[PDB]
Structures are given as structure tokens and as C-alpha cells.
């Protein structure tokens, strides 16, 4: 199965996020290319519960967390499903990369199809911040761009 | 279950399409509000197979047609699942309305979540055109706006 999200906003940030999962049990390969970020920085990259763009990136809601856990790093046992960590940006402010994740799926009851991918203005502290905000958003700040995850060929 | 699609493009047409379905067997209520169309006209309103916006509204692909039938009116027995007919525009070019459909669903294997809603520049002949193009698109012309159907609260 294949999915795609086109990140857009009015803050100059934009990109594309592709998703690939053969079967439910197999991890999903996430591939991204996002431009217009701050150069040489780490930016929060998350999947939110709703694919609702009626009010900018805010209507996407909280991080997808069907199991009601706290915010963590993608390598953590305790993390939200939509916790993909931080993406690195180069000297030109472009973040290009790829990775696999076993909690993010395009098939089954926890499918992210129809939900939103969000890129942050700030760095995700990965839940290690000494605040309770850290346990929900990683204190990653504003959402300059987002896109609904749709199905593709 | 509730879904929503925000129609956007560079042709001045835009709007919102809401979807509501309680259970699989029950019809889905489609509610829309689209502005920027030609005034006092009928415009093709369809759901396409892919929620892919990487290339404007073109990457949405053909009308959703999992049962491989020809293009028809929503009241036809032979029609594509994404065949919602034409929406009427007023003297100000706004199309506002609502309706229920039993083939369009937000639940099950034919779910439209993650697919695209498209508004046309022209009128859907409803498959009655004397061309084979009529049997696929209804000859509705260009796609000025489209949006991915995402999940919402
Ligand atoms: Cl977020
Ligand atoms: Cl079409
Ligand atoms: Cu976030
Ligand atoms: Cu069409
Ligand atoms: Zn999180
Ligand atoms: Zn059709």
C-alpha cells in the first residue's frame, strides 16, 4: 500500500512525505523532502489525529495516540504513534531523508491514511523536557506546514 | 464517523465538503459549500481514486470505481461510486447544499477516506453524452479545485 502527504502553509515551508507498507505486520517506510526550514537545525516531524485542514494546521489536533501514552522519541517504548522525532535540515534549510517505523501503519485499525503529517517550527525535546508540555508535544512549537495523508498508486 | 475535504486550487474556486456516516450500512450525508464557480450553472462534483495532490488535481486520478462500471448519475444503478452528479451554483457562483448517498461510505473496504473530492469547470452530462468520454468523466472538463478527504472530530 502507498500513501502521500503534501505539506503546505503560508510560512514558506513545504514538502512531500511518502509512505509505503506491503502488509500490516511489516514496518512502514517514511520518505520525506521538506524545504524552507531554518538551516542546520532539528525540527519536530509528527503525525496528528485528524486530516482536518479547515483551520490551518491547528485542526489536525494532537499527535495520533490511540494507546494513550506520553510523547517520546520514535525509539522509545512509550511514545505516541505519530512520534517520528526530528528531521535534520541542511545549510539550505532542506530536510531530505527516509526511515522505517513499526508503529506507523497504512493498514489496519491504526491506519494513518486520512490523518495529518505536521512539520514544526521548533525542535522536539523528545519528551525529556522538564515540563508536562514536553509529554504531549515535545515542546516543538508552531506548525508551519501540514498535509492530509492520502492514498496513491 | 466524520470526514472533511478542503477544496483548493489556483483558479479561484474553493470550498469545504463534509461527510457523515454512523455505520457501514447507513448512507453518507454529503454537505458542501463551494465558491468561485460560474454563476447559475451546473458543475460536476466527483470523488476520485487517489488522495494524491503532488500534481495539482490531476494526480487524484479517475473517478473512484471499485466495481468497474461506467459513469452515470448518482440515481443510476450503473455509475461510479464517486459519481455525485452536478452541484448548482447561484448568481454569486456559490454552490451550497447537502444530500445522502448509499454507495459513498466512510467505513469498510470502499471507504473514501484518503481519496480526493473534485469540483469541475464544466457540467457533467451524466454519461448520456454520445461519446465514450461521457462514459468515464461525463465530459465535465477541467478540475479547478480538489481536496483530500480526511478524518475529523
Ligand atoms: Cl503537533
Ligand atoms: Cl474527474
Ligand atoms: Cu507535533
Ligand atoms: Cu470528475
Ligand atoms: Zn507526540
Ligand atoms: Zn464517474
From Swiss-Prot, chains A, B:
Changing residue 122 to K: Does not enable copper chaperone-independent activation. The modification Phosphoserine is found at residues 25, 38, 98, 116. There is a cross-link at residues 18, 69 (Glycyl lysine isopeptide (Lys-Gly) (interchain with G-Cter in SUMO)). Zn(2+) 2 binds at residue 42. Its cofactor is Cu cation; Zn(2+). The modification Phosphothreonine is found at residues 131, 137. Keywords: Antioxidant, Copper, Cytoplasm, Disulfide bond, Isopeptide bond, Metal-binding, Mitochondrion, Oxidoreductase, Phosphoprotein, Ubl conjugation, Zinc. Zn(2+) 1 binds at residues 63, 71, 80, 83. Pfam families: Sod_Cu (PF00080). Present with 519000 molecules/cell in log phase SD medium. This is Superoxide dismutase [Cu-Zn]. It comes from Saccharomyces cerevisiae (strain ATCC 204508 / S288c).
Amino acid at each position: 500500500v502507498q500513501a502521500v502527504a503534501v505539506l503546505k502553509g503560508d510560512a514558506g515551508v513545504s514538502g512531500v512525505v511518502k509512505f509505503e507498507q506491503a502488509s500490516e505486520s511489516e514496518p512502514t517506510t517514511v520518505s520525506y523532502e521538506i524545504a524552507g526550514n531554518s538551516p542546520n537545525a532539528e525540527r519536530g516531524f509528527h503525525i496528528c489525529e485528524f486530516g482536518d485542514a479547515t483551520n490551518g494546521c491547528v485542526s489536525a489536533g494532537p499527535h495520533f495516540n490511540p494507546f494513550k501514552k506520553t510523547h517520546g522519541a520514535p525509539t522509545d517504548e512509550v511514545r505516541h504513534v505519530g512520534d517520528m522525532g526530528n528531521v535534520k535540515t541542511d545549510e539550505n534549510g532542506v530536510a531530505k531523508g527516509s526511515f522505517k517505523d513499526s508503529l506507523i501503519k497504512l493498514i489496519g485499525p491504526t491506519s494513518v491514511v486520512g490523518r495529518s503529517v505536521v512539520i514544526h517550527a521548533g525542535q522536539d525535546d523528545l519528551g525529556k523536557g522538564d515540563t508536562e508540555e514536553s509529554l504531549k508535544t515535545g515542546n516543538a512549537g508552531p506548525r508551519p506546514a501540514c498535509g492530509v495523508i492520502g492514498l496513491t498508486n
